[PDB]
Amino acid sequence: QYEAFKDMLYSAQDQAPSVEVTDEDTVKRYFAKFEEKFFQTCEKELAKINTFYSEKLAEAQRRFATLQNELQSSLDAQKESHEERVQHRNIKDLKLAFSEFYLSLILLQNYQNLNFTGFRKILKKHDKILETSRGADWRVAHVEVAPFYTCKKINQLISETEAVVTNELEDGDRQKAMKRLRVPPLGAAQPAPAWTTFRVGLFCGIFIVLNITLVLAAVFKLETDRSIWPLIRIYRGGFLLIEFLFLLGINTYGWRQAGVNHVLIFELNPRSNLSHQHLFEIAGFLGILWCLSLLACFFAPISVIPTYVYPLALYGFMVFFLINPTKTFYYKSRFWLLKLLFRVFTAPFHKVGFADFWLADQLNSLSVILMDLEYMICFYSLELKWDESKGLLPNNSEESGICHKYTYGVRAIVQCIPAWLRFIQCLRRYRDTKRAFPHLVNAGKYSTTFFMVTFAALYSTHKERGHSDTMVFFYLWIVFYIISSCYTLIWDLKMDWGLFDKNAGENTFLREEIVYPQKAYYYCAIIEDVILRFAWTIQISITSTTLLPHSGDIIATVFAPLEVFRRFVWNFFRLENEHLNNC
Amino acid sequence: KDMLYSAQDQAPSVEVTDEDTVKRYFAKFEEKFFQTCEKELAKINTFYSEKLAEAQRRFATLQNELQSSLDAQKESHEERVQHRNIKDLKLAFSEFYLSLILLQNYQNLNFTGFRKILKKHDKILETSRGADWRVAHVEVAPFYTCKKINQLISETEAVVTNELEDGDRQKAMKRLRVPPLGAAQPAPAWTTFRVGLFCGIFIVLNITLVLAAVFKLETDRSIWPLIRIYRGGFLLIEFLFLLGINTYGWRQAGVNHVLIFELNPRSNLSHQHLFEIAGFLGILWCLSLLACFFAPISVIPTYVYPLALYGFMVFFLINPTKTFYYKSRFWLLKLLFRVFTAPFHKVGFADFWLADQLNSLSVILMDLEYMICFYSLELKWDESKGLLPNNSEESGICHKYTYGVRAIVQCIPAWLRFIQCLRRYRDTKRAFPHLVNAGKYSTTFFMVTFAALYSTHKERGHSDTMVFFYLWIVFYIISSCYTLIWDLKMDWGLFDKNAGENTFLREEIVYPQKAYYYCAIIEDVILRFAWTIQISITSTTLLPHSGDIIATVFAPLEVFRRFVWNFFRLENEHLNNC
């Protein structure tokens, strides 16, 4: 109430005239009016302070009752592998609750002290201006006799509860309890040693310069005599992967800006995790490797092996890095990732957790890399002859198009593997939980993909023979597209993010409680998602406006670094909503 | 991790004797560990008891002082005296409380470390007696559990604020706000990110530079003048990088260079910052060089690209604004101003150091002389036709010696050292060091004037030129070996006659390895007589266009000598004077 006191003092000073400016009676009347206004303001401030103190006392009592109930529940659970993990989670939750209670008590004490200091300052200012001694008396009767400052049993109770929790759970491990209940938590990273950040900067700088020299060489040195397009087909997918990692770096920083606890939801080791700088430096390493490989393929200084070793060497280096058995180069993280890939493929043996379907969904937007893997095998096995030079093969030959066409239609299965595995995983989820409300609908949502791809493949295979009745099949493909798109939209908005809920309140189109700073970010994310998820519609416009061959493959390449973005933005609010419920 | 590694490396024999001997050995090791842990616990308990006694004594003294102040108050100048006494008592109480809190925190940290070590030993040795003993005895210390000291201190502060400060609780709390102690000086992560960026771009640009030079470059064009220009900038960025390495070395060695330089207690700079500016300089130099040779854009001539860079140089220093390390540039500008006068200003250590550095940066003095030279009487500003893009004798009267414009620019830094040392002798009235420095720097003038007169006489054909040149060579050594005996005797303070247990070195040293010292000595001997190789190579038939190549390759080694000489010069004066 410092602002109100300052405004009242300014108004009183303005209402106070000079000695000779106004008459004695008028000056006395103005002084009486100012004193009455000051008394009314002081009474209002005292009432507000009393109400705030009562509310704070009620909140403290409620917090103490909740802490006691949680402690009793934890003691009952302790009295009466997976069990060890559950006990550790309960201990961590109790420690977090105790730390929150201590922080709330400290904040309440600091706020009470600040309010008392402000009241004393306002009383001093009123005494200086209006020459009245009532402010000091009010401050003495209120600030000095404040029950909140006098009540110090809260600190003793908090200390006793913390000691009891440490004795019962930590079994005398005071260091772990102090670390878990430490006042500082988020905020200061904590910064890594300077070598890691220096490596990140060096790697990103080399990546940038290599990109500039690559584009300059492509626009200047390259001769438009040979179709470089297949090269993109063997490189594009790799780019997506590295791009993905870059985003993931920033992604984790997001979870460090909102303060949402995300290490626990992944069941990761709290004393060993992967910071954003590590992901950034891995991204830099893979990026510089990719740039050097592509530049070497572009120039080929040595005219003995034109193309057959550069992409294969790059991908072999990548996989060897992935499954390196030595205890170096983030061995623990690589082993954990390989174990989770095993688990997501060996689903039926063990329970399904968060990270399982999280990684499954991430791969769902990464099917392009599977397409390019099938394409490299596709080019290398049937129609490319190893015994040649350079590889200047004109497209006029009839050998081309052999595995551009669907042939047996294997492309549908390789396209739909993520959908199939998500369908199976959701089915097992329903079998284990016996509850079908959020699962069979999810199964149908992933099942729409089967129909989408099979219709697209059948139309593409059958358009050449004729049978003008394919217009009906084209219409069915389109309507399946629309229904899949709206199903994905509604599932993402209502269920995945919890937005558009019937219980909105003052935060229109939002949930009751949010953690991200601004709402314009929410709205911009929504509009970006709703433009991106009908990307293919824009594609169809080209096929409705141009008859130029092979025009759809370039726009698809531009379309490729967009499904990684819509997952990047979706990965933000997914953990926010999932912070509420449990899997 | 010492227990985990040392114990595992023992590798006891599985089948060498009966299990009784192994059990006895394990029991003996456990008993020794228990005795060590008991001794450590007793020492920690004694330290904690001493800290608690000191804290109790400090609290009693503070309480007595507060009671005396309250009694005096209860009973103008008297009010001011009472306020000053209250402030002094509050400051003393705050200092005592901070010391007690630090002691308690140290004791708690020591106890936690001992408990962690015991737990690690128990886990490694697969035993439960040590952890149980630590939990029963070390973890049951009542001193750590007792936290009434903080509550009593807070209550005393509140009472003092209420009774003495008259409701100024916030001021008392701020004056007695001591709890989470601890501070350091960590470098910002963005600084390391920036230096990493600049280093990466700089190396990659050097690689593209060398590839372009070896591949696309053709012989017909004139390469020499361009490298004459670019040597100065290369030397500048090199010196900046070695200066950063030098200041990191001083900081790590613990030599208090900030006090001997009388800098502000912030140092006005950090080695990371030197690294960033050096990287930015290298980026500009590489971009400019690639622009000159590649020349991709329009019809802009190649003779303008360096100027902007060089302009940027002065633009970096004479920028009116308040950005780009505004404290360092102003300090360096004023120091470089006060160095270049000499008689007008007083002599300080920084001026002596800067003049010494400028002595070795000889090349960056006459490169600009050739610069203004071509841009005065060799340029083709207006048009671009057959206006002598080729080379002949007339264009290039300037890269030789000829007039004294080159000898004098070579001799400026020695002039500055001579005059500054004479000023020191004048205002100090000291004989030996300044007088011998006068000679050691007049040898420089003698060598340069002899070489200049030889060069200007050879072009005319006077017979005595074949004699005087013969003298030039000796006039070099009589200088050079003098300078050497100066760097080791007094400049570094080595080869002391009253040497002790340490061979060929002074008795007290700070750097770890003596091999560093020996390497420094031998490197100084090699690079101080570097000019012998120059005359050795040009002591025979003169290969066409092979004159100045030796200078370029020998240029960065001279600064590399300045790299090592700076380590001991600062240390020797720091150790002996301070």
Swiss-Prot record, chain B:
Residues marked Gating residue for phosphate transport (site): W531
Membrane topology classification: Multi-pass membrane protein
Positions bound to phosphate: D356, N359, K440, Y441, R528, R561, R562
InterPro entries for this protein: EXS_C, SPX_dom
Compartments (UniProt record): Cell membrane
Impact noted for substituting Q410A: Decreases phosphate efflux
Record annotation: effect of changing K440A: Decreases phosphate efflux
Result of altering R528 to A/C/L: Decreases phosphate efflux
GO CC, alphabetical: plasma membrane
Chain segments annotated as transmembrane: 187-217, 223-254, 268-295, 302-323, 347-380, 388-429, 431-461, 465-492, 512-543, 546-578
EXS domain: residues covered: 397-578
Outcome recorded upon mutating R562A: Decreases phosphate efflux
Involvement in disorder: Basal ganglia calcification, idiopathic, 6: A form of basal ganglia calcification, an autosomal dominant condition characterized by symmetric calcification in the basal ganglia and other brain regions. Affected individuals can either be asymptomatic or show a wide spectrum of neuropsychiatric symptoms, including parkinsonism, dystonia, tremor, ataxia, dementia, psychosis, seizures, and chronic headache. Serum levels of calcium, phosphate, alkaline phosphatase and parathyroid hormone are normal.
Subunit structure: Homodimer.
Similarity field: Belongs to the SYG1 (TC 2.A.94) family.
Protein's recorded name: Solute carrier family 53 member 1
